[PDB]
Design a protein around this ligand. Structure first.
Ligand SMILES: [Cl-]
Ligand SMILES: [Mg+2]
Length: 420
């Protein structure tokens, strides 16, 4: 009967873990790629709990800061008879507003096959910033944590790229705001992106600029405002009504070009495009090289479109517009022009998207067919190799939810990259 106090020792060890875990303000569950025992591999300023190399002790590497090292201490009180241990952590949903965690701490007795310990014990955490870095179907055998915030996070740049075509004067259902009573799409976009800015502000260390696009793109605010120095200057731009004035067609490639090149010139380590469009892509710019012979066919007066038989997209870092370089279809019905408009955005993404963490695309229309190429546009932008995500917002509160979700997801990239 050496069992009785081995089981008591494992339980007290687990209470030790739960005690120190209960004081953490951020938690990462780790698999054996970022913890092997040791201190070889430990990311600085993160404290850790996990099993020894020999697998026989539960230990706690605490961050020193003043000695800038780890204070290797065993969590527990006594030997365990050179027994080898199995330690596993797991998130397990929530109880009210608390996130749950499960602990496993077992091991078979010397040279018996009697399992000892706790197969699973549920506890609750005091932080909502609990993250998993367990790839694969790996087990997850260790934890990294902090008890005080991470001081000095990364910088984040967000380029907003907003459709300003003429359709943005109608209401979400595509009816005239004078005959219905509703706000215009642009009215709703102004309000809901002001909200999104104040929400982004809370993350801290986060700058934004504003690109408009319709027939072609324009910087509404070209340089990046840090919100920690004031929400004020950009909210003035978004709500000033000589700005974002609806007019033109839909040239998302050019908008994306302005967005991505301005992001390339920002130092931030997390970079984002938030692209909002309310219509079928129906415009693109060509390089001057494409102005030859019978390449440009001008059906503009009797069909409402100008197309290029062989488009060479305007991929220049020199940002310019000329009517002679414009492919477009005012009726958004010609399959070729639509294809060329979507492909332009993909070519722009491949050239200009190298540093970019994610492109979010928002289809913002209550009219089904106007956003029927939102996913298609996003997928083409995805050829540039970054993460992409398409969302449709068909009413005023879908948009505010999509904005909030995008904030929540940037906050989580930030947490995840500051992590161990
Ligand atoms: Cl998607
Ligand atoms: Mg439109």
């Amino acid at each position: 009967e050496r069992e009785a106090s081995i089981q008591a020792e494992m339980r007290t060890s687990m209470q030790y873990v739960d005690r120190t875990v209960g004081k953490a303000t951020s938690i990462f569950i780790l698999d054996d790629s970022k913890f092997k025992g040791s201190k070889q591999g430990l990311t600085r300023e993160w404290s850790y709990i996990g099993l020894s190399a020999d697998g026989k002790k539960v230990m706690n590497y605490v961050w020193n800061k003043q000695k800038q090292d780890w204070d290797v201490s065993e969590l527990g009180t006594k030997s365990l008879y050179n027994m080898k241990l199995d330690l596993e952590f797991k998130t397990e949903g929530a109880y009210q507003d608390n996130r749950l965690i499960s602990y496993n701490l077992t091991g078979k007795y010397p040279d018996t096959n009697n399992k000892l310990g706790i197969d699973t014990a549920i506890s609750a955490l005091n932080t909502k910033q609990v993250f998993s870095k367990v790839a694969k179907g790996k087990k997850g055998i260790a934890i990294a944590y902090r008890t005080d915030p991470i001081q000095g996070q990364m910088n984040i740049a967000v380029s907003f790229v907003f459709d300003t075509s003429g359709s943005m004067d109608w209401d979400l259902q595509g009816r005239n705001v004078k005959k219905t009573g509703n706000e215009s799409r642009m009215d709703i976009l102004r309000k809901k992106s002001v909200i999104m800015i104040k929400d982004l502000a809370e993350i801290g260390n986060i700058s934004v600029n504003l690109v408009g696009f319709s027939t072609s793109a324009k910087y509404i605010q070209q340089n990046f405002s840090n919100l920690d120095n004031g929400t004020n200057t950009i909210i003035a731009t978004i709500t000033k009504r000589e700005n974002l004035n609806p007019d033109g067609v839909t040239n998302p490639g050019d908008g994306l070009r302005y967005g991505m090149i301005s992001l390339q010139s920002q130092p931030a380590q997390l970079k984002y495009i938030v692209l909002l469009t309310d219509g079928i892509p129906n415009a693109y710019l060509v390089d001057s090289r494409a102005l030859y012979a019978g390449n440009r066919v001008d059906l503009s007066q009797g069909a409402g479109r100008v197309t290029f038989n062989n488009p060479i997209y305007d991929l220049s870092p020199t940002l310019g517009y000329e009517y002679s370089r414009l492919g477009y279809d005012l009726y958004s019905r010609d399959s070729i022009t639509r294809e060329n408009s979507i492909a332009y955005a993909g070519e722009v993404s491949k050239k200009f998207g190298l540093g970019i963490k994610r492109v979010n695309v928002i289809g913002f229309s209550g009219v089904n067919h106007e956003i029927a190429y939102g996913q298609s546009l996003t997928d083409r932008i995805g050829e540039g190799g970054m993460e992409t995500k398409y969302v449709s917002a068909t009413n005023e509160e879908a948009l505010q939810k999509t904005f909030s979700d995008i904030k929540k997801q940037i906050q989580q990239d930030l947490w995840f990259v500051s992590g161990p």
